[PDB]
Amino acid sequence: GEKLKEVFLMLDNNVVECIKEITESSRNGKLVFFVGAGVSTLSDYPQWWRLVDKYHEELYGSPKKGNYSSDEYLRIPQIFYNVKGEMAFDGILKDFFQVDKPTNPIHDKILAMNPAHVITTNYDNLIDTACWKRGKYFSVISAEEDVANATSSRYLLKVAGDFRKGFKGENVVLKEDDYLNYDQNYPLISNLMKTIIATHTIVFIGYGLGDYNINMLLNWVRKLQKDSFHKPFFIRTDPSPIENETLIYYENKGLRIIDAASLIDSNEYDYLERYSAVMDLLIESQENKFITKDDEVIDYIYGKISPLFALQYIRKIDLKHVFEYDYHFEVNGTVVRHKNKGFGYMERFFELKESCDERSKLSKKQYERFNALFNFFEKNGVICMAKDAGTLNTSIEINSLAYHGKYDVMKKFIEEQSVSIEDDYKKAFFLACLGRWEESYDLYSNIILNSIDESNGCVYYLSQINRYRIYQSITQAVTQFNGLGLLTFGRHYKPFTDEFLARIEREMTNFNIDDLFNGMPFEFQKKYKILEFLSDNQFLYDDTVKLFELTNKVRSEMSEGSYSFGMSSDIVVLLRLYDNLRFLYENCLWSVSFHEFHQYIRNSMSLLIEKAEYERTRDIDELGFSFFGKKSGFFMEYYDFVNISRHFKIDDIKNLERS
Amino acid sequence: YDYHFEVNGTVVRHKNKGFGYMERFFELKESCDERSKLSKKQYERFNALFNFFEKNGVICMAKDAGTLNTSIEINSLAYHGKYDVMKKFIEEQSVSIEDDYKKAFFLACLGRWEESYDLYSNIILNSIDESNGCVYYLSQINRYRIYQSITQAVTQFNGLGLLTFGRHYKPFTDEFLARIEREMTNFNIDDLFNGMPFEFQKKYKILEFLSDNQFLYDDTVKLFELTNKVRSEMSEGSYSFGMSSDIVVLLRLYDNLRFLYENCLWSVSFHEFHQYIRNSMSLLIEKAEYERTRDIDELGFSFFGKKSGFFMEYYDFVNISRHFKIDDIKNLERSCSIDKIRFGEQEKIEEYLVGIAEEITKQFSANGMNVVFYTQFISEAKAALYFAKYVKLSEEGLGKIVKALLFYFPERDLDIGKRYVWLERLTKCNELPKSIISIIDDFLVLQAEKHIDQNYSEVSSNGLYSRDYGALIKHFEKNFISKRLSEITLCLTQDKQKQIDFLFKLLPLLSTNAKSHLLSFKSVENINDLMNGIRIGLIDEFTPEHEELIIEYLETRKVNYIVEKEKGIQTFSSNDYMSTFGIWYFLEEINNSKMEEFIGMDDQYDFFVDPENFDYKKFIPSWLKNYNDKLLGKIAGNKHMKHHVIEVLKERVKNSNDKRYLEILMNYFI
């Protein structure tokens, strides 16, 4: 139970630096388990010594008298195959391997460690059933034909064959002829295995440092040059603890060993105790339960928020994806525990803030990171926890000259010299707002060259989107210029030359925005997962379906005087609108001018006004005319004027004046 | 994106600069001569496509635009409420895995979620053949929405479900939640479509929208845009012109219901999908009020006399009965005149209303209450019997409905007062025959057989008690008497206390030997029975013992709220007796001249007694909805009340969607 936390403090510096690197690879999606016979025997599966007891007695008459020599143990199923045929070799395999045995809790812990691939030398079907119970598909590969006919790009690579194509012995490598013809019969299973090891993080489960598979894999590693490959990890589940001279010998061969008999004290036959004490020590280090240092909560919040310093504002509905749904961040600034089955690292952060002596107990590096996080959350308006919600005032502030319509200040900003690549990303958004879309497409193009040779993830990605959106904004404008805009304008032409419109067609040919985020680096796709939605053809669909809980459902609320607890439905819609405007205008995203965004402001603002009317008039006939207030309760302000003035057609303001 | 496939069946090309292949397909459809110029292996494939588009209702393009008709068929047992047929389908050996997917949906609709969670789980282990992920993907979704339905049930069963359900129910064992919590933890519904093989994606792209809200988004945007277009068209004079805003709303609603029920998706039980149908139907009913009132000349008489939202069918009754709450329907009953809206298919509706009444009896009479099904089913059973006002039902179907609404309906979700509200609505398109009065009379003798203890009362929210069931009898048939109520009056003594008050409230239902024997046993001694005496027609002219006790109650009220205001408590119109005294003084039923000193107790009482002194800022506009015909005639005769409360009606005509305030104004006060 709580033994694992007092095991964890007894780990040395070697095992802690193994658990920190196995768990950083599971979060990156580069973790692969290499599964042996150890997890198959913990499900009662017929071991290969129970077969070799069958052959020696159907080929030598009597059962075995003495131990198997290694000369005999390798060659008994080959003597049976050569002398007693090939249908009887497959008969004995059919007699023992029709079992339908259960999956051990270790098959669940491997998959709960979220692997990208699973390689196995097990010819059983036990790992393949457990993958299909969960909501991820693995392309099972057990023959040569399955590699080119692969489907899902997450492989369950069975490098020792399988019995999916029948209980035949020609589909599973078992004999000695199948051990020496493996590179001839399986050229593509070997190359696919050696490429996953070269490109991922490998952990071996179910082996014992002398195996035919571990030794033929450490020979391949001897051929590779120094420091080009990551060293595989090796979980050792044996009764005897590892001796120090052996752990030196396998670390120089390229294995990073985590001995399970060196971490817990267990009996000689309790293999689930040893397998679960290393797997649960990885799983409960990811589901962060081994954080009891009060300055490890700083470099955990810093490692997920220091990416987001490159952006200006982050929505609070996006911060519940940064922390992997552990906390709700409500629009008041309150943090509410959701799915954190671990240590309260956000509860502790707000206990550093009100305090100061608990804060002087930090280091000389992790105290400056507290001042980076405190200057983050104060800017974004994350205030406290749920149980400290006093009298809160969340006033919206949009610091953007394009929102406020300072058109002459933007023109001076365009003429001035460009010191940064951020001061150019702001100009190209100011170019597009002023309608000089000719120069905006070119200036985004100059950012796309200069940001990919300078290790800038956001400014490259946000310029790919805004160049495509201004490409859409041009190519659907000329549709009005050839049509309605030919008789409206006196010149009967666009300011888009025939050379410019033809040039953007060569560059934007076959440019799919749907594959942009996956064509970014792996560190971009983890640190900036919150920016995936901008490339999507339709966002704001959660915000639109959550408008039915506005003036539509005032039927049961106003008929009995029902009010929403905490933040009311008026305040949640109005402050998730303000988070969308502050995210889109401060991060200079050109998707703020399109019809999907403008109709969302029309749908949400009208329904907030129609709820404030239906309620105003339900209070009049229920609780008298003089007792009901003349104001509707919907108090409009500066930011509410600008949003109605910018996003509404005049036929849409006429609808509010009637309703 | 090569073609628009509109909701009528027509095809308009967009983003297709290449070859037009759906242009060719309908040229191959209606011309058999160009057919059989094909091959042989590509000809049996053609018989699948012609059967496919005939099912999905795709017709020729906008060039050869024929007159399409508005028809819909949902061949789903869970849609029509065939509860006994589903139970005989679940208790039957399954042939295929496609029949396992329907039983897991039919268990889930029957509230047997613990079995459906298991039955969806068996499909997941048995759907290994990669014939198509369509079975495996749609069962991962439907299981995770069952777990979402269990988790929000056990939050409202082991949490809030103690005082509102009657007990601390545990319909799901702790061994069940110890299984379902660890299984559904670390299960991302956003990662289900992306972790799925590439043969499934780009062959089943349309099913990715089922993991979140974006299968409703394209119809939500269209519903919000066409709502403002209709509310602009309802004010600017234009009717439904051709392919108008009403048929686009109706066909998208029908395609959503038919995609979700035929494919057995458990997204039918969301809140957000119950909100889409609710706003889609309340717009069509509001447009139906505008198309029935006819203004312009013969261009609109042929355009749409009563079609495309102006007429009601069986599928429209079931959508309102399942997806509305009662306050949802109570909105439309004053914004619209649903009594003027013609309901068709009134024999298919009658099979639906009988099946609901015959699934309350198989759920609340026998054992096995099935409290999980009881949460989902009771809203549909309440809204169907509330909206059964406007259908015309035969005698053999109404008898099962009244005998369920009275007896077998549960009292936790419908008290004794909210049975009279719905028994009276079944007298709008119906009378009370001699076969329905006998069922109401069977219910009054059941409550009279339970009024022995004094501790038993009648918790009524509307103020309407079990006396009004007999008042609904005496409204139709004046010459009626009751048999078993005239037998229970033989036992009159001081043993049972609650037999004293309940039998007094049913006096015209009694016989001559029953009424005289009751008056020989007791008489009136309180004004509470005097309020009961008017509703039974006991005393016409009040004896001066009453007019003493009328102001004696007012004098005790003058004792009451003076010392109650020091403590902050108030009894303002608690039992409405002094308000009923106010109508009595206003209709000159009391000749006392002492209530000038009683002015200043309640705002309603001060309105009736001294209208010159009562400032009309404290007047509540809902009071005019509760006055009868004779009372408004005297208000039309006054001058003090007359030319001032119109200003209250003037701010309710042009600010409230209640059409009653217009009716009180034009028929009485002007």
Side-chain angles (χ1 to χ4, degrees), chain B residues 25 29 48-58 258:
Chain B
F25 181 73
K29 182 178 74 68
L49 297 173
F50 182 76
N51 291 139
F52 187 78
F53 291 110
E54 185 178 1
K55 182 258 292 180
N56 283 312
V58 177
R258 189 174 179 179

Side-chain angles (χ1 to χ4, degrees), chain A residues 229-253:
Chain A
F229 61 95
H230 296 287
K231 291 183 180 180
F233 296 98
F234 189 84
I235 287 176
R236 183 179 186 270
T237 64
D238 289 330
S240 66
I242 196 166
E243 62 271 10
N244 200 3
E245 59 267 17
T246 296
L247 196 145
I248 296 299
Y249 174 71
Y250 282 101
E251 195 270 331
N252 198 4
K253 290 179 73 175

